[PDB]
Structures are given as structure tokens and as C-alpha cells.
Amino acid sequence: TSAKIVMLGESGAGKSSIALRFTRNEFLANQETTIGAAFLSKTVMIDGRALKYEIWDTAGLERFRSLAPIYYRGASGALVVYDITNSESLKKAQTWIKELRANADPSLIIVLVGNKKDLGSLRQVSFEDGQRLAAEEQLAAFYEASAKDNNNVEQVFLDLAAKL
Ligand SMILES: Nc1nc2c(ncn2[C@@H]2O[C@H](COP(=O)(O)OP(=O)(O)NP(=O)(O)O)[C@@H](O)[C@H]2O)c(=O)[nH]1
Numbered sequence: 001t002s003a004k005i006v007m008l009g010e011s012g013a014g015k016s017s018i019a020l021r022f023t024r025n026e027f028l029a030n031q032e033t034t035i036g037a038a039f040l041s042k043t044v045m046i047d048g049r050a051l052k053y054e055i056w057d058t059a060g061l062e063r064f065r066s067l068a069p070i071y072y073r074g075a076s077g078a079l080v081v082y083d084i085t086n087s088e089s090l091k092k093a094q095t096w097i098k099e100l101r102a103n104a105d106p107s108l109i110i111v112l113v114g115n116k117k118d119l120g121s122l123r124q125v126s127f128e129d130g131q132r133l134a135a136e137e138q139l140a141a142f143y144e145a146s147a148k149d150n151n152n153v154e155q156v157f158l159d160l161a162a163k164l
Pocket residue numbers: 009010011012013014015016017018028029030031032033034035058059060061115116117118119145146147148149
């Protein structure tokens with residue numbers, strides 16, 4: 001069985017870095033902005049039974065927003081990513097969550113992920129503030145993570161998988 005997941009969120013928050021870290025163990029300090037949504041795969045075991053993630057890594061720039069439904073229409077899950085160092089990205093994440101609730105399948109499982117936890121002092125979003133959004137929106141899970149340090153990336157995907 002397979003998990004069809006879409007990555008959404010403001011450009012620069014680290015959608016491609018998370019999905020490449022998870023699927024390929026690849027991180028780039030100079031990851032290029034995504035033009036057309038990229039497809040990425042990986043198989044992971046659940047509690048014995050095998051599982052294939054099929055991930056659509058969307059371009060986050062607002063000019064590519066109208067393309068996002070092509071990638072979210074058949075999705076089982078969405079990871080809506082923000083950057084813990086940039087307060088504005090959390091409000092962008094809230095807009096995506098609302099858009100998904102209005103336009104996507106009501107069974108869609110949404111996980112909120114605050115990325116770049118490794119950037120210490122530059123944090124602008126508290127754990128408390130990110131989770132307040134996830135609780136207010138009754139999302140499936142809330143994690144802070146670091147694609148760069150590979151911290152909590154595996155755990156976000158495993159958690160999401162168990163909720164599908
Ligand atoms: N310090 C730090 N930098 C990160 C982390 N994840 C991503 N980055 C950096 O942030 C920049 C943008 O990352 P990227 O994955 O391209 O973001 P995106 O959300 O895919 N952008 P777009 O929507 O335009 O494709 C890159 O320079 C990348 O190295 C992280 O966990 N920590």
C-alpha cells in the first residue's frame with residue numbers, strides 16, 4: 001500500500017530539503033527553488049508491514065499557487081511546512097491549511113512541520129505558537145524538525161503514515 005503525500009508551504013521554508021532528506025538522505029545548503037513540483041519516493045516499514053511514500057514536492061512561490069490542486073487532489077496526507085525562524089511563514093501555513101479544508105478531500109490528514117530548528121537563536125515562532133495553530137485547526141500532528149541536521153524528519157513521516 002502507498003502513502004500519497006503533498007508538501008505545501010511558503011517558499012524557502014524547506015519543503016524540498018525535508019522531502020529529499022527523508023527520501024534520498026540528501027541535503028543541499030544551496031537547494032534550488034522548485035519550479036515544477038518534484039516527485040520523490042521511499043519505502044518504510046510500519047509495524048512489520050511495508051509502505052511506499054509517493055511525495056509531491058510543490059513549488060511554494062505564490063506564482064505557482066494555482067498549480068497546487070493538481071498535486072493535492074489525490075493526496076492521502078499533506079505536510080504543511082513553515083520556517084521557525086520566520087514568523088510570516090506560520091501565517092502562510094495557516095492559509096494552506098484553510099485552503100485544504102475548503103478544497104481538498106475531507107479525509108485528508110494534515111501535519112504541520114516547523115523546520116530549521118537548528119537555527120537556534122534565530123527562532124521567531126515558539127513551539128507553543130506553532131502548536132496553537134495545529135490544535136486550533138485539529139491537525140493530525142505537529143513537529144519541529146531540521147532537514148539540515150536530519151532531526152525529526154523520519155519521525156514526522158512515520159507518524160503521518162500511522163494516521164493514514
Ligand atoms: N539551516 C537550515 N537550512 C535549511 C533547512 N532546510 C532547508 N534549509 C535551507 O533553506 C533554503 C530553502 O530550502 P528549500 O528546501 O529549497 O525550500 P523550499 O520550501 O523547497 N523552497 P521552494 O518552495 O521555493 O521550492 C536552502 O538554502 C536550504 O539549504 C534546515 O533544516 N536548516
